[PDB]
């Protein structure tokens with residue numbers, strides 16, 4: 780698809796058996812999801828941006844279906860105000876910015 | 879161009895005759911730049927990021943070139959970690975997300 784930017788680029792994802800709405804975010808290095816359980820090992824991480832830092836749990840090798848496209852990678856879980864699909868998974872679905 | 883997302887989507891911008899680096903950020907509603915001098919009056923704005931909110935200065939109808947594409951629009955100035963080109967100006971340069 781071609782997604783214009785007149786509105787926020789929100790899509791449906793499936794993660795950990797759950798459907799969520801998430802922002803396709805070229806400004807985010809990694810994917811960050813609101814609090815949920817995921818299986819397997821994790822380790823703590825701090826991530827920063829406008830307004831400072833939050834503590835998250837880093838889960839590696841997590842499968843996510845993004846607008847119907849499967850990808851695997853790291854998912855950070857923590858108190859993000861918005862679910863964000865970052866570059867680490869945008870690359871895997873072949874997302875590009877075009878102008 | 880067609881910009882892939884394996885690296886941060888950094889471009890050169892020009893504002894007030896000065897070249898700066900900025901991130902093309904589909905997850906940002908609005909363009910936010912680090913402290914600089916801009917002409918004219920400003921209005922207050924609160925924006926919300928990953929870590930909470932920052933107060934910024936809103937300057938309207940500012941001339942800005944983005945990766946060689948001319949825009950005129952709103953620029954927010956405040957303590958952002960990186961200069962970010964948000965959707966308000968990504969639409970002016972005709973940017974879409976594609977996969």
Ligand SMILES: Cc1ccc(C(=O)N[C@@H](Cc2ccccc2)[C@H](O)CN(CC(C)C)S(=O)(=O)c2ccc(N)cc2)cc1Nc1nccc(-c2cccnc2)n1
Pocket residue numbers: 787804805806807808809810811826827828829860861863865901903904905906907908910925926927928929959960962964
């Ligand atoms: C005006 C404005 C300026 C900058 C930003 C912004 O910092 N965007 C964030 C994403 C975001 C969006 C909304 C809330 C928190 C985080 C940006 O795209 C990515 N950030 C990095 C950039 C600042 C360099 S980030 O979120 O800090 C970040 C850092 C590390 C990682 N791994 C992932 C994300 C957002 C807005 N506002 C905005 N933009 C998009 C959606 C909403 C929103 C959504 C729901 C309800 N209300 C507002 N609000």
Ligand SMILES: [Cl-]
Pocket residue numbers: 851852853867868
């Ligand atoms: Cl990854």
Ligand SMILES: [Cl-]
Pocket residue numbers: 873882
């Ligand atoms: Cl590629």
Ligand SMILES: [Cl-]
Pocket residue numbers: 924925926927
């Ligand atoms: Cl905001």
Ligand SMILES: [Cl-]
Pocket residue numbers: 950951952966967
């Ligand atoms: Cl604008």
Ligand code: NA
Pocket residue numbers: 818819820838839840841
């Ligand atoms: Na894992």
Ligand code: NA
Pocket residue numbers: 917918919937938939940
């Ligand atoms: Na103005």
